[PDB]
Design brief:
The structure is a homotetramer. The first copy, chain A, has helices at about 5-35, 50-75, 85-90, 95-120, 125-130, 145-165, 175-195, 200-210, 225-245. With about 240 residues, chain A is an all-alpha fold. In chain A, α3 runs antiparallel to α4 (about 95-120) and α4 (about 95-120) crosses α8. The longest helix of chain A is centred in the first third of the chain and has 30 residues, at about 5-35. Chains in contact: A-B, A-C, A-D, B-C, B-D, C-D. The interface between A and D is large, with 52 and 55 residues. The structure holds octyl beta-D-glucopyranoside (BOG) (8 copies). One octyl beta-D-glucopyranoside (BOG) binds near residues 87, 90, 98, 100 and 101 of chain D. Chains A, B, C, D: Its main location: membrane.
Amino acid sequence: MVSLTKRCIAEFIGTFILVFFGAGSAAVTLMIASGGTSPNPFNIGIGLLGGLGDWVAIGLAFGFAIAASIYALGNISGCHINPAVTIGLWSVKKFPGREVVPYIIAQLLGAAFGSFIFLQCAGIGAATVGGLGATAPFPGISYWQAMLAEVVGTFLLMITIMGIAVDERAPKGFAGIIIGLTVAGIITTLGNISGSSLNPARTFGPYLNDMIFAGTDLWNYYSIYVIGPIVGAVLAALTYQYLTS
Amino acid sequence: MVSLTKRCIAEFIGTFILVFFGAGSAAVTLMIASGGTSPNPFNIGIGLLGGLGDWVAIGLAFGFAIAASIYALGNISGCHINPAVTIGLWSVKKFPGREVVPYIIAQLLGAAFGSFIFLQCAGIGAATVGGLGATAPFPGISYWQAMLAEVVGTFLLMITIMGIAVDERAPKGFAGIIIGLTVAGIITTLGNISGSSLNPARTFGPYLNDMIFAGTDLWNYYSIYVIGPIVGAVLAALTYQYLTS
Amino acid sequence: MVSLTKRCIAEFIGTFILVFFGAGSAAVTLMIASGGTSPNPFNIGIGLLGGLGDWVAIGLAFGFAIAASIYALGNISGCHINPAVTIGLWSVKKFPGREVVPYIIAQLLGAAFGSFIFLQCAGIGAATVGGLGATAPFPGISYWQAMLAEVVGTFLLMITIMGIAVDERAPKGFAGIIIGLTVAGIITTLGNISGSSLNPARTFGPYLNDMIFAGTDLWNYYSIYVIGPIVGAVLAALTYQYLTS
Amino acid sequence: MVSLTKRCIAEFIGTFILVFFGAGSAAVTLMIASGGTSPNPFNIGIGLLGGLGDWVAIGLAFGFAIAASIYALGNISGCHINPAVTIGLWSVKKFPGREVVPYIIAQLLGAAFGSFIFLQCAGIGAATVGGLGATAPFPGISYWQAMLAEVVGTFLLMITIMGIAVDERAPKGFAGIIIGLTVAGIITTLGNISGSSLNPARTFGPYLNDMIFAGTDLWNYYSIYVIGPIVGAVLAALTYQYLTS
Ligand SMILES: CCCCCCCCO[C@@H]1O[C@H](CO)[C@@H](O)[C@H](O)[C@H]1O
Ligand SMILES: CCCCCCCCO[C@@H]1O[C@H](CO)[C@@H](O)[C@H](O)[C@H]1O
Ligand SMILES: CCCCCCCCO[C@@H]1O[C@H](CO)[C@@H](O)[C@H](O)[C@H]1O
Ligand SMILES: CCCCCCCCO[C@@H]1O[C@H](CO)[C@@H](O)[C@H](O)[C@H]1O
Ligand SMILES: CCCCCCCCO[C@@H]1O[C@H](CO)[C@@H](O)[C@H](O)[C@H]1O
Ligand SMILES: CCCCCCCCO[C@@H]1O[C@H](CO)[C@@H](O)[C@H](O)[C@H]1O
Ligand SMILES: CCCCCCCCO[C@@H]1O[C@H](CO)[C@@H](O)[C@H](O)[C@H]1O
Ligand SMILES: CCCCCCCCO[C@@H]1O[C@H](CO)[C@@H](O)[C@H](O)[C@H]1O
């Protein structure tokens, strides 16, 4: 109904909001905790002052921002704001393959830009101390461990999306808040393991800005936040297709 | 349907509740943390004992109070309880320009009064230590940085409002809780940057009482919490008008 | 529709749940924080380890328990589970004066019993250290300050109830969660001031058990948690009657 | 409507998600707090860095995961994902006794597997330090105290389920989020007492993996997390049957 051009602008805004607010809270957490003493290496400083409370706070910053976006942009573009979701939807004939790349590009741009504008609001400390909320494996977590966390996490996100936003029997009006709260929950447990990206674009944004405004190069991890989410999403979409078949 | 006089009383009550409960939680946080040692200057004491957890708690105190007000006063006056929202609504022919000033004045009074009654409940420490939850740029944040944070923040608030309360296709009954939770999320990330006002009246109240009951004069910052929110709201309203056009 | 006898049993259960879970979380908080060092006297130990985060956690324990009860017992007795609400409803011809006392008595009993069973689960430390979550003015808060906090707090609770549960235009199904989240918000800001009772029975339960199983006598404060809530509720009910008249 | 075989797969997935995400957050909390100093023995380290905030965070990780599952798998199998609920439903002619064992077995397997996959993501520290989120009586809590906590807790969970998911008058679409938030609330207060299992399978999973990958043998406690929940659920189901009769 809405032109692909405007739906792409919407996806841009939605992913911008997602990275600005979600990743922003993570960065800010590290900034107000910087200089504190951690009990052990696993605690990189996010759960330093508020324990798991800090992780639920970050998860909620993501969740509420996501819910708000879905309610604001859902009717416009469907508010995927996540490459893995677009692909997941695509994998079960729920989204036109012809629009997959356009959306993904708008998502990637929005994420990059969202991370950039936040970096301007909070100063350079957000990048040099908060790392702009970039998702990377945590201390003691191997490459495949983070991979696994990302597929199980994105699996939950997608199967929830399938059940509450795609299935025709879903309760109207609940998709936005449920999808958001679900992400908040996944981040609460999987955050201190892989950072709980569940979104290739959510990771892309921070990575990019982190490299340009900091001598950082986290790209040797990106594959985790690309393959993991995509595999998790498609697995969920198909699984749900089978269970309701 | 309801007389402008009663809808103004409603706006008064709604903004009173907003400042009393929201700004109140911020003040209280500083009061129970006063005397503690902070890791660095950025942490002014709000995330001292609970990290980002303290910010989500403050955001939720705002959010739940806002949701409650919208459900209690929405049918009466529309529950704008925010000058920027009234103006934003106005900017897209969704509110009578003739009532803009009346509402804004009721909002400003309610906010001032709300801050005043809270100051009486918690004693003068709420003002001399908690600063009554007044929003001011945080340590290391320049004037334009706070400005930017406020427009991006209010942009999200308004576009959400446009999508869930103004658009005729919005899910009935969700506006209240969604708008509230959205504010809670914005405050979680933008709080330790500009205090996350998003509301000229929410700032006015505390500023006023802070000056009268404390040798404080934060008015050299007020422009941030006036221009920032208004610009963000109007930008959001128009953007949403374009995307759905 | 349901017999007064069964609706009284329901009120009993609902208030039992309210005090068991809500007041219980407060007690538990003090128990896991006991032995810690506080920054100042205002911080009695509740915001010691989690700052305001601890207050929102307690507020949510109350809120979620309240929402659950309203969804479980609402259709049975209306789930007042609060003398002030019953009276408030009564004050605007929304509840039979003939049933006011019966409900209030079931609420008082349920609260007393709820506090008693919790005391058995957590041991006597819940009473000697957690005080069973009894609401009393906080350090530096005078008698009238707590009084004021309780009327403003209960005012919000009731006007929300009026708007979302009594008004015929309210969105169906939202009353439970909204009422609950509203209480969670009031407790977040007003908790460290008066303990944020908003409910004569919620206070009665703990007070009683605290006296019987601890040399405590907080009854010289009870009037605050009786008059404050009742005045706040009636004021809200009438105010809402006027604004919608 | 859906084959018992697919509904069993669903129950498997739902309980997997429940244990993976819920119990996972508890384990992670202990891992980021390990090495810290506790105020007293009651605080085993979960409320160490975030106070009660840590408990609400764990409760929410459970709640959001539970809500998401109910929205994703509810239409498929009813999403019991808890032996006590299946039995409770059974006890009031709301579920076929012939399917009770099948569901319970899928739940038990899912829980065991869910705990296993999480153990792989977070490394062995999740088991040797976080105990995989296994529920056991807390310091100073006797066997019958934990038992009581579990029946009162599961009583609330079930009566809420009865009111919002079983009763034909329940508001459509609210069951998922309400059931989830209710669990989050029960865990917030009852967690530091018995760990707040409310689910024989949620306990089984961790116990099993804890024994196999750690010299742990918590099975001398399991009866608490079997009898307690079942008794609480049945008591709630019958009580609700009586009150609405
Ligand atoms: C990692 C897997 C990504 C899969 C996304 C594939 C997007 C391309 O999808 C293809 O686009 C074409 C037009 O451009 C259409 O004609 C094809 O039918 C469609 O399948
Ligand atoms: C961009 C192309 C990505 C292809 C996916 C490569 C996955 C292999 O990735 C490698 O796996 C090893 C495990 O044996 C790890 O030890 C290495 O650190 C990791 O980089
Ligand atoms: C910062 C920008 C604030 C814009 C708010 C403008 C409110 C005035 O708005 C004006 O009010 C008049 C009656 O008073 C009406 O007759 C005009 O049509 C209306 O535009
Ligand atoms: C009340 C009228 C407000 C007009 C808006 C004025 C905005 C200029 O504001 C000024 O911008 C400077 C940046 O160059 C900052 O360094 C100053 O601190 C700031 O006050
Ligand atoms: C603190 C104020 C409490 C007011 C509650 C008053 C409850 C009594 O209310 C009265 O009960 C009588 C039967 O018992 C009825 O016949 C009366 O009409 C009714 O007003
Ligand atoms: C049970 C009957 C209660 C009647 C209400 C009495 C209210 C007066 O209460 C008193 O107010 C004084 C303020 O001047 C305080 O200093 C006292 O501590 C307080 O008890
Ligand atoms: C701890 C109590 C557990 C009760 C669960 C009982 C499940 C068995 O229930 C029984 O299953 C039979 C078929 O297998 C049916 O024919 C019976 O009617 C049914 O009652
Ligand atoms: C698997 C079969 C379980 C049967 C339930 C047994 C309940 C008794 O359990 C016992 O109760 C005692 C209290 O007197 C406690 O002191 C013991 O530690 C406890 O194991």
